[PDB]
Swiss-Prot record, chains A, C:
Alphabetized CDD domains for the sequence: AdoMet_MTases (cd02440)
Binding locations of putrescine: 66, 161-164, 230
Assembly notes: Homotetramer and heterodimer. Component of a multiprotein complex. Interacts with SPMS and SPDSYN2.
Residues annotated for S-adenosyl 3-(methylsulfanyl)propylamine binding in this entry: 36, 67, 91, 111, 142-143, 161
Catalytic residue list: 161 (proton acceptor)
Family: Belongs to the spermidine/spermine synthase family.
Full protein name: Spermidine synthase 1
Pfam families attached to this UniProt entry: Spermine_synt_N, Spermine_synth
Length: 290, 285, 290, 285
């Protein structure tokens, strides 16, 4: 066969037999750091694209879906979060999403790979803005260690913007991590972590539900969302709360209506209907995840 | 063999309808590759998705996710109206819509209007799996111009019309314009409903706006828009327009006539489809 | 971090703290197979690059050096070779280099990755030709085992166009693999293997040399040659013969000249003098490697 | 500055003297930076390559591989002629070449002409295992202009001149032109030898062709060429022009006067450096 040139194709064994492609406009930077083969390129129709170890880490055109999601789903499910921990901010947009919340005192943007943080701040504009927030506390270092040596009940929310459980990052999906997460969460605190796709990782996702269930006394839930530039297009999330005040993940307490940010910036892919709808899972998975 | 693509031995769906991006599947074996008086037809064997159906290069369906679109396009509307009996389907498919429409044991006559006689063969022959949709009694198959049969047909004789059409890549743009949505308004009974495939919020919020607009002028009852996840469709989602004629008030947002078992559709899911995202919810005010 | 964008930088733990880079002109093919990461891009001043698992495999500008040296250092060293075997598709250029030898009756390459044989041959001209020669039999699929199914003493030479000893190819440097080459070769048969750089892997090179000093009982020799696009600027080779007629890798019995392949093009890098010069090692390595 | 970098926090060596490519080293810490009356003197600590000396954004030397260039450039000449007594070195900011020359007992005096005291200093404060070379009894260090030093030199008063320059791009371009060579010629005793840094075969087969042309015009004895492996120089290799004036024969391909021991250069390597690749052997037969 003959392959038409000019295209970038996302391929993984984690999603075999299929691939999402993007016409590359211009190469902006590729390098294998100590942790990952990083890449930043200008696509044809999706703008700038960040790729880590092969997997499209994010896209400008639809970053709002993941960012607003992984962030606001848990942040709007609890009253006035003040101290929030962010692990894996491979861009700073998730961080930007946080700044929308006025009650936020400080965020511990804990990222480990500096090639990324650097390459993100340069090429990505509205993305590099996050790190700039005053309340932000950036720290280049390991994440699992950061959470072990973490004070007890100091955080209001834990957001794991991790990648996939392929190599040493598999910890962030195992029980030793979830227990390390809960330790840092105060009673009633919440954690949100991406949990792969329903069309491709039932088994994996299922283990994650069992794990979170055997660690959180609160209400562990799985909500999914739409994001085109992701594998299959339906990446999910785990929402868990610790023993303490009840947390209704299905009905945000302080949902960002739109004006609840007004002069800050317009919400692109989030509102009160999406937050609840997000949870409605398909039958085939509904029975399993329960 | 494999000629057009951006990956060896793999099929890549690309078109000016979603340029700059493409979705690809590992071709196990190309089963059928022919041409009708309408378009190019291909049925390649998937290594991880099952049987595949491609029309003019656009993946129409695969075995792995034929449940989503199908349990979406037929039940969203068919679960709304109470006790539907007369249903009109316009489109090819692999018999899936039928597999699902026939689930509504309430219906009586199921007129299906597939114009491309070749899409029928391939579905019937190559997809014996859901091709049973045809082999059902309640079903009345018709090979001819969709816009035809409809236009030239009794009035108020239908409870629902499902436009399982293809994307507006040309001649089918007619199924997105006012004259068609009028032929549907007549053909439907009072309080009757329409459910048509309506682009992707991620890719055509503008075309989707022209559709919402057109429909909004023709239907004085209830007009709605719903989107569902379908991995094999560009952007990962596909939209639907839900409209009701003059008469009894319909609430598409909530299933009034609820129901192997279903795989994607379920009360909750049904209401989800009507929770468009912000940037999208804006325009489609 | 005001990095000039538009450059591909070759990186690997195999060479910490250093990197080759090329101002990319345009992307031609960038995806991933079952075995490795792949890239084919139009560089600004080196024509076309080909990368496997993030490691520059070849440049049309300087691919002559490697392909010409890896092929002729062994062949020219032996008279009238008839049946030779090559492992590691790469691109076919090496395959093309073997073709220059008129006495060859059959050539066989074993690229365990059809994507490479496909994408490469497809985007490269004077490279695909290798697969073109009538004497070739492209046996796609693991070659370490290929020799296992090979008849004893059925080859005059074995050329291991492998990659860095990091991927699964790390086995291609182990004693068991070499024992099969020895038994697959006729008595007096020669082997030539990509053997890293003296500037970066002296320790490793000693173990590789040790292993051939055991498996192969003929003459053992470490040759090296300038190769711009490989890390450190140079590359090594192991020339080994099995017990039988003696083989002097240092003084070629019949080096290529030009008229020997008039219609194949003149030789761009190889010549008798550069052949002998290849076996002259710098002092620091000389002492160690003896 | 941190402009010429294709990797944040790293030093990227880019220049029109070899466009389209670039050598980069991970920077552990910057040790010195200044703008002398001549050029930029960058000096940092490379994560795993030792202290690197950088001038006008071009790698001048790295502790890890100084031995190659230094050993070859110095012993190529000094080992082709018998009993060298007086030797001149131009632009040897580092001391490494000096150290190398001083290894030749027969030498009674080593002349040095560096046009920038700053470098000799930066080198003295940061490169011990080389700058040591400045402190030899026979070394006559001079700070001034080399083409002038040669122009003022007494006729036939040198056994060997070492021309350690940069690139024929700026003011140092005059060192690759006939005027300067003739000057170097007048200065050499009869049968004397000069060794000039003559770029990469992979990058300048044209610039290297003009040089071979001038030297072949000015010199009547011998005018050869040698290339050696130096990882940190563009293309991983760099060349040398070896010339000998009218007088005793001089065979550079075979060191007539063969030599802490040297870590690179040896007799075999010495002759090996004259075996050029075919594509190169053509342009400069």
């Amino acid at each position: 066969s003959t392959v038409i040139p000019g295209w970038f194709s996302e391929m993984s064994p984690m999603w075999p037999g299929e691939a999402h492609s993007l016409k590359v406009e211009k190469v902006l930077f590729q390098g294998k750091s100590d942790y990952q083969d990083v890449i930043v390129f200008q696509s044809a129709t999706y703008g700038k694209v960040l790729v880590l170890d092969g997997v499209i880490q994010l896209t400008e055109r639809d970053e709002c879906a993941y960012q607003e999601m992984i962030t606001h789903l848990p942040l709007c499910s609890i009253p006035n979060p003040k101290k929030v921990l962010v692990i894996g901010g491979g861009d700073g947009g998730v961080l930007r999403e946080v700044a929308r919340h006025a009650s936020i005192e400080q965020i511990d943007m804990c990222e480990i790979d500096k090639m990324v943080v650097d390459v993100s701040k340069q090429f990505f504009p509205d993305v590099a803005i996050g790190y700039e927030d005053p309340r932000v506390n950036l720290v280049i270092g390991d994440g699992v260690a950061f959470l072990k040596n973490a004070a007890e009940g100091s955080y209001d929310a834990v957001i794991v913007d991790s990648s996939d459980p392929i190599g040493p990052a598999k910890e962030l999906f195992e029980k030793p991590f979830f227990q390390s997460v809960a330790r840092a969460l105060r009673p009633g605190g919440v954690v949100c972590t991406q949990a792969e796709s329903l069309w491709l990782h039932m088994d994996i996702i299922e283990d994650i539900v069992s794990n979170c269930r055997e660690i959180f006394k609160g209400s562990v839930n799985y909500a999914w969302t739409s994001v085109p530039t992701y594998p299959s297009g339906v990446i999910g999330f785990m929402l868990c709360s610790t023993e303490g005040p009840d947390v209704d993940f299905k009905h945000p307490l302080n949902p960002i209506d739109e004006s609840s940010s007004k002069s800050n910036g317009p919400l692109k892919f989030y509102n009160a209907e999406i937050h609840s709808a997000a949870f409605c899972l398909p039958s085939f998975a509904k029975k399993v995840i329960e």
